[model samples]
Target: SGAIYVGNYRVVNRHLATHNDWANLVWEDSSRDLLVSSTTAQGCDTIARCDCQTGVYYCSSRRKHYPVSFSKPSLIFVEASEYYPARYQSHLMLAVGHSEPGDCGGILRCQHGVVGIVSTGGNGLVGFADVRDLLWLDEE
Candidate 1:
């Protein structure tokens, strides 16, 4: 029941950073504390845990985990239409998929939907089901 929404579209929040699992402590850094709701552009739920002393963080999903570094904590959120201003808005929209091979120096294309970042260079993925399930902001 932790889902958030902008206008009518729902913002998923399953793969957000948290301090719930002690097993994830090894990957946690104590230098910075990140507290935010997140989802992969692909819509996979991820787990981001911190240590509060080292200022480092790790983000992971069902398949893999990646080391991440950030300057600040607040992530950036952009509207789906902002990416494609010329396109018509759909009742339901999905984030942009991965980019073409060897095009953008490993730039992710998980556009559309509710997309954002933790600091600057770290990348994570989020699936739809987990986010929609865990983030139940709607009171129905």
Candidate 2:
């Protein structure tokens, strides 16, 4: 079994775990492909659109506790470009924790190869794929 493993993958802390749990509350839109926004407790919220097989989060179905709670200046932008590293390909960028606490929701596109994260409503969070970064919208 050649499962390339790392020397030590630092375990998640209690606070991190708690935040991750809170991140479970996500928003997935399936209209223009599939989009998933990882609404974590940290200031690193993300957004992405792709395809899926099954799940309550469809193109237009916003599940319970699946809304985002953005701050004062949260923003998002997406587009087809090669700005981010080799990892972020055709991905929609996200910038969370703008300033204050409040509710902000909408879609965004990338610009100049850099995309901003869309702000969700305060108390609400969204996540896509990376769990740490934004979700992978483009399918393989």
lDDT of 2 by residue, 1-140 (tens): 00001111111111112344335423332211222333322322223232221122111223122222222221233233221222222222223322111111222222111122222212223322211233232211
In candidate 2, how many clashes are counted?
41
What is the C-alpha RMSD, rounded to one decimal, of candidate 1?
16.2
Q: Rate the local accuracy (lDDT) of all candidates.
A: 0.23, 0.23
TM-score of candidate 2 against the unseen true structure: 0.18
Off by over 4 Å in 2: 1-103, 112-114, 120-135
* Residue lDDT tens for model 1, 1-140: 12333222333222333443332322222122112322323333232222111121222221222232222222233223211222222111112222121111111112122222222121232112111122332222
